[PDB]
Design a protein around this ligand. Structure first.
Ligand code: HEM
Ligand SMILES: [Xe]
Ligand SMILES: [Xe]
Length: 110
């Protein structure tokens, strides 16, 4: 088992450090980066990202559905290219396989 939860945590750290304004689109808006793990709303969003990763690896992930749902938050290609940079970093830091291919499936719909 890859510690996906831990990777998701680093990933969120990377993403919000580089694009802090992204964080305003969540229910943990305005919460200090170093406090995220103590915030209920974050805890739920992180679990869901981990779920998706496990579904992408599992073969059950609906990439088109996730893309439409991000479109529904005015989150598009540019954001998911940025996230690809951030996940690459967070995976590499954990010796975990990269999620470039899964992130690519999402991009193919954005
Ligand atoms: C690898 C990249 C990402 C993955 C795997 C991912 C995963 C998810 C998942 C699984 C959900 C819940 C889907 C649902 O049931 O509606 C979600 C919601 C969301 N995503 Fe992403 N995320 C990604 C990147 C981003 C980025 C770059 C942004 C830009 C801000 C973003 C913004 C949001 C927002 C605002 C929500 C809903 C928040 C809420 O309901 O409170 N995501 N994401
Ligand atoms: Xe991710
Ligand atoms: Xe992913």
């Amino acid at each position: 088992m890859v510690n996906w939860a831990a990777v998701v945590d680093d990933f969120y750290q990377e993403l919000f450090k580089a694009h802090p304004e992204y964080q305003n689109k969540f229910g943990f808006k305005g919460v200090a980066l170093g406090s995220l793990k103590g915030n209920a709303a974050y805890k739920t969003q992180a679990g869901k990202t981990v779920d998706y990763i496990n579904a992408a690896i599992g073969g059950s992930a609906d990439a088109a559905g996730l893309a439409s749902r991000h479109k529904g938050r005015n989150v598009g290609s540019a954001e998911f290219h940025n996230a690809k940079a951030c996940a690459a970093k967070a995976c590499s830091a954990h010796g975990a396989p990269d999620l470039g291919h899964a992130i690519d499936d999402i991009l193919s719909h954005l």
